[PDB]
Design a protein around this ligand. Structure first.
Ligand SMILES: [Cu+2]
Ligand SMILES: [Cu+2]
Length: 258
């Protein structure tokens, strides 16, 4: 039936409806730190989120998305390995049922408790819908979360989760500043890959930050309280919404640092 993360509609099944699942530039991957090449020609990333306009938070049945007004160059990403300007459209998380799993990307096979994805689309394409059809249409910033100290900047999100418990619910979510989710350092790895949920289009330039952010155990616990199901359906907790690591194939992971 429709795709999800269960035993019967899980990631091992996606290929039947999205043959691209077995493509040559599928994401996520395992980042082998000793095999990543330092590339001195990579410029520093430029994150400009000071004018960010969040609008809404939605439970889509596979994660929760915070959405931004992308009608103008308000929250953009540029520099790094990118050409052109990429506008922030939404962010969402991938997490586990236990602290020992939940990230999509791994580092030397280490899994983190969660992974944040900030999705941006190439302004040369005019809209998101057109950008996913291009090899350089999207740029995704991935950030790992580990359990330790609470992240103050994440609490606003945590607190609205009760109001969007089941698939299809949404809530006004204005004045959220995504700068409160960045680590101190912007060092990163980059490789060409895809979206990690169907349609699995190979339109992404991934930018995965080296430094994780810490969240408290209690912050991560509130994530695990969401549902995959719609209201009035039997309860299926929203956990383990992560796709395992895919073959690297013909690709090189570049590092912005040594
Ligand atoms: Cu769906
Ligand atoms: Cu994602």
């Amino acid at each position: 039936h429709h795709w999800g993360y269960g035993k019967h509609n899980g990631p091992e099944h996606w290929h039947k409806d999205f043959p691209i699942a077995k493509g040559e530039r599928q994401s996520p991957v395992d980042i082998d730190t000793h095999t990543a090449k330092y590339d001195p020609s990579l410029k520093p990333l430029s994150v400009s989120y000071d004018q960010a306009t969040s609008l809404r938070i939605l439970n889509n049945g596979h994660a929760f998305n915070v959405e931004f007004d992308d009608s103008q160059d308000k929250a953009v990403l540029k520099g790094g390995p990118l050409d052109g300007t990429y506008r922030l459209i939404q962010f969402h998380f991938h997490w586990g049922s236990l602290d020992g799993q939940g990230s999509e990307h791994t580092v030397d096979k280490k899994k983190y408790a969660a992974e944040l994805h900030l999705v941006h689309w190439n302004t040369k394409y005019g809209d998101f819908g057109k950008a996913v059809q291009q090899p350089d249409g999207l740029a995704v910033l991935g950030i790992f979360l580990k359990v330790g100290s609470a992240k103050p900047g994440l609490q606003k999100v945590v607190d609205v989760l009760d109001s969007i418990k089941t698939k299809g619910k949404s809530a006004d979510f204005t004045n959220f500043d995504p700068r409160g989710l960045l680590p101190e350092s912007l060092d990163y790895w980059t490789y060409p890959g895809s979206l990690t949920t169907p349609p699995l289009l190979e339109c992404v330039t991934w930018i995965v930050l080296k430094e994780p952010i810490s969240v408290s155990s209690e912050q991560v616990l509130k994530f695990r309280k969401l549902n995959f199901n719609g209201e009035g359906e039997p309860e299926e907790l929203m956990v383990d919404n992560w796709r395992p690591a895919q073959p690297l194939k013909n690709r090189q992971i570049k590092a912005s640092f040594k």
